[PDB]
Assembly symmetry: D2
Homo-oligomer: 318 residues x 4
């Protein structure tokens, strides 16, 4: 029995017995993602080169912004591309707050590296006029989150209370087909992912942990290394193959580099729903209470046994 | 003035004043690539999931094999998928020998990591009946080589005596548009790429070189690290951003891990034509004389200054 | 503010405050149409011709059948492709009955003539076991109807109580974009459409009417003639440009040739919702009470002034 | 063994042992057609409607063909419906071919999503002097190649040359024209007649009688069926595939017909003759008419031989 993102979303919405807003929000998001995917695969680039005789990041941001606003399901929108939280005009306001990164990893897009869209959805908790404050909720309050990976193929990973489901975009009919239901990450993996070019500035715990992956003190097989440089790609591989992903804090960056609202929380949410873990080293990413919409946060996530092991090393240096 | 792969190839062929065979071979390869790209982006996956009530690597291999045979321009075909060299039937034999990897990186495709097609084209040298021996030529004899990267977007990099040219596939019209003419790699980069999970087994020279990238002895800025795990993706980033890529021998791969005929030689050829370098440590990849179609070869390639620097360290440990 | 078929359908469904079934049915129908469109435009035909070394009407029928069944919104399905009404298995039954022609005009498909999908949706009006009898309702009971035209471009015309809306399929993202809201047909047109090859067998009223279009009584300019041979194409042109379409009953087809349940009623419903008319000559198509799911019905539809004029001629010969 | 437009064209070009220009011209035309098809199927129309918060199709199509042909370095004179005057390719991009074309035939009624197409005719410049409009004034008999692209239920490119007529289907998944019908030949006699009967009042007596014979066969055989899309490429293609006859004759108001000789009539007449069919103006074969104006009109009756011959019989009776 084939299932599509539209059908899946509509059914979960029916079960929730609500107003149908989140359904419309998700449908709009879905449409924006297919539009971003089309642009990422360079549809029509021939016209840009004169066959008939301006940035992907900005276009992606416009697509999400416009689709979400026109869904009438949102009131506050926080994007990695905008300095201030966007406030939806009164006549199009819904009860949801959305934090997102329209095109994650679009800084190296010149090498055709995988890129993606990350998003986190919250329910406005206060009756106050919508403001940036409404997006300052701990990831623990997420109602839904996920990402779209524009890699060899386009996939949308959607996480909610019912679990994590993966949909593959069929370009022939512009439909997201459900190919992986209630996904669970491997208990322990064999791959570690992080930019080792920062070795010199690594925190001692990170240095020792990576050293244990390369030189297992018990002489077991060393972990393999992978680092794409695009969070959505690295996190998705971690979910699919298991293992651990790190973008830790150091003396020069006490809070890390990745952003909490639209990068860390969404991925941490997907991880926990899949039976994985996501920590900053001091606490679970989802429990961090934000004070600034663009605040950074250190993050170590992936297979539970792997994160637990990291925390063990971290505790030793604490 | 727009230019397409078809137009470009046809023009270069006209200038060569030959039989037009290589033109037909390249046109056929081009068609196979677009077909592979369509399958990689999962066109029609909905039918596989029951919307109406073969493995990618095998399909890709079939596409290349069939298009090349039907081009009447080849006589011996070596592929990563087949144990023995395929010999084209007499009535479809041409004078070219093609070595290729239909879908490079298709092993970690579950995570939607970038994948690609690598190829190297040789002119049959010996006059004996076509056999596997015709594919045992040093990369120095290549007439043309390149790859197709199926990443955020699909691009075909084609290298010939005239240089390296990059074409972007416009999915809207199924046409490869020329977007980068006579490409040259940066003299020196700031990124090193290799699987550091093998640290324990690294040869001393590799260990020291990597150490110099992380802890510059001249206290300059440390290089950044990237490792996708897919050769076409890692090599393409190296070409575009500069830097160095390594897959040196391991103690469990005394002769390196990558294959000489359809992975190393093609990439080394593209690098040299772009002003870059490609060495095994002992000699230029292109000068190695193969004795077996699937033999492995160590490889260090990328920006000249970076490779030269590695060779300096290598020589110190020799 | 852009609007999509999905968004539109979901909103009208929310306002109806029902179970959401019709929403699920329409979404499923939408997905089936995009799949049919992809196959009609011949996606993948290259594989059929050996690039790598079922009939369209059957496939189309399977797509609609499977999507509708899996929607859990239907119970009785009538298709021009199946002699007997299909009864949905108990575990997938919904309250709707759907009559449709999977691929109208697929008989003359070899000439690439426009083809389409016609559908009519009824609410099961009985409390007993679903049977063919549930599809024998007069078009007057339709809850929704429309068609998909696979012409120069693909468009879905959907008619409901709120009116007629036209959606254009954007192939790049597989999304139906609303381009024409609350469409109304011209009061009077300048085009008449019917197969004049049947002149010899025409009913005197039809003969006189056509005669008035060619040799105008009020010395007005003669109407232009157009006859594609595909109902969806001819009817759509009528809706867009106005005028009249005819497929009357001659001497051997006293009951016409087109089918009442999945050709005539749906188009008649779209016409009336657009301010147009649809008559059999004796009564409004929508008022005919069917006794056989495949019974034929004569039909004259289009601009009101044009149909009224035909009826005037018809009455003179009655 | 699969074959594509590119492969086919490259092979025929190799056999001709020429400069390769026509190959580049055809490759360029092929690319332009795929781009036109993409636009006709409305790719990206969502952006036109604000999904992210514009020129006419006929104009775009004309630009695509013009630009691709110029950039092919194989042409010198280009005649299209869009520009009143023949376009002269700048010296640095001049080739030896002359191309007459209709970028988007039937785009006057593209609102109803009716089938549309691109028609083209290719000539070799037969003068040594400076390229001018005069080089496009050759009888269709001189055509080196001609054909059309039909943007209907699916997109197909029909290419006619000395070797015959070949039909290629565009596979949108890979942007490749796949050869699906080799050396096509039209049926000797068909059962369908096509023309705008709304002009009955102004029909020439011969046309009136001929149509009368199709509807009321004298020997009481089965009457012909009628089809009229209103788009020449669609009507002509159906004629080629199913056989029969297509007419757009001269009448009271239009003594020289309505269709254009250089980029509508000649190309279709050439495809018909190469397929074993016929194309007459009533007085002579369309291909033999010597044009004096690049946009001159010409009456046309084409299709299955037996059907055209029969028309000519009626025509001669009224002459
Ligand atoms: N389309 C979907 N909606 C919901 C999903 S999936 C999961 C969920 C949990 C709680 C309320 C919801 O919806 C609440 P409302 O927005 O309908 O009021 C939903
Ligand atoms: N389409 C292209 N052909 C050739 C290119 S690109 C580069 C090149 C070098 C030498 C001979 C060639 O052609 C040799 P032949 O195969 O035509 O005899 C070609
Ligand atoms: N998506 C749409 N639903 C409906 C539309 S459009 C128009 C309409 C009329 C009456 C009931 C409906 O819904 C009835 P139910 O199937 O939800 O119970 C709907
Ligand atoms: N691509 C094709 N070219 C030709 C084909 S198919 C058939 C033909 C006949 C005569 C000259 C030609 O071309 C001569 P030239 O243009 O190469 O000088 C061609």
């Amino acid at each position: 029995d084939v299932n599509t993102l539209t059908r899946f979303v509509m059914e979960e919405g029916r079960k929730a017995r609500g107003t149908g807003e989140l359904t419309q929000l998700l449908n709009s998001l879905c449409t924006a993602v297919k539009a971003i995917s089309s642009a990422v695969r360079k549809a029509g680039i021939a016209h840009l080169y004169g066959i008939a005789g301006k940035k992907l990041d900005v276009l992606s941001n416009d697509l999400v912004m416009n689709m979400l606003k026109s869904s009438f399901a949102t009131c506050v929108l926080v994007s990695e591309e905008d300095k201030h939280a966007i406030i939806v005009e009164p006549e199009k306001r819904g009860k949801y707050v959305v934090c997102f990164d329209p095109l994650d990893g679009s800084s190296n897009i010149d090498c055709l590296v995988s890129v993606g869209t990350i998003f986190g959805i919250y329910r406005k908790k206060s009756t106050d006029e919508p403001s940036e404050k409404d997006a300052l909720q701990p990831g623990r309050n997420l109602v839904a989150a996920g990402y779209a990976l524009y890699g060899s193929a386009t996939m949308l990973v959607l996480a909610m209370d019912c679990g994590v489901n993966c949909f593959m975009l069929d370009p022939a009919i512009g439909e997201f087909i459900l190919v992986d239901k209630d996904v669970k990450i491997k208990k322990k993996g064999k791959i570690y992912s992080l930019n080792e070019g920062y070795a010199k500035d690594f925190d001692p715990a990170v240095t020792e942990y990576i050293q244990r992956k390369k030189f297992p003190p018990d002489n077991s097989a060393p972990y393999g290394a992978r680092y794409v440089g695009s969070m959505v790609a690295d996190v998705h591989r971690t979910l699919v193959y298991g293992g651990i992903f790190l973008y830790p804090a150091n003396k020069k960056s006490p809070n890390g580099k990745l952003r909490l609202l639209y990068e860390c929380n969404p991925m941490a949410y997907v991880m926990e729903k899949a039976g994985g873990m996501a920590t900053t080293g001091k606490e679970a990413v989802l429990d961090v209470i934000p004070t600034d919409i663009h605040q950074r946060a250190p993050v170590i996530l992936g297979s539970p046994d792997d994160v637990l092991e990291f925390l063990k090393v971290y505790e030793k240096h604490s």
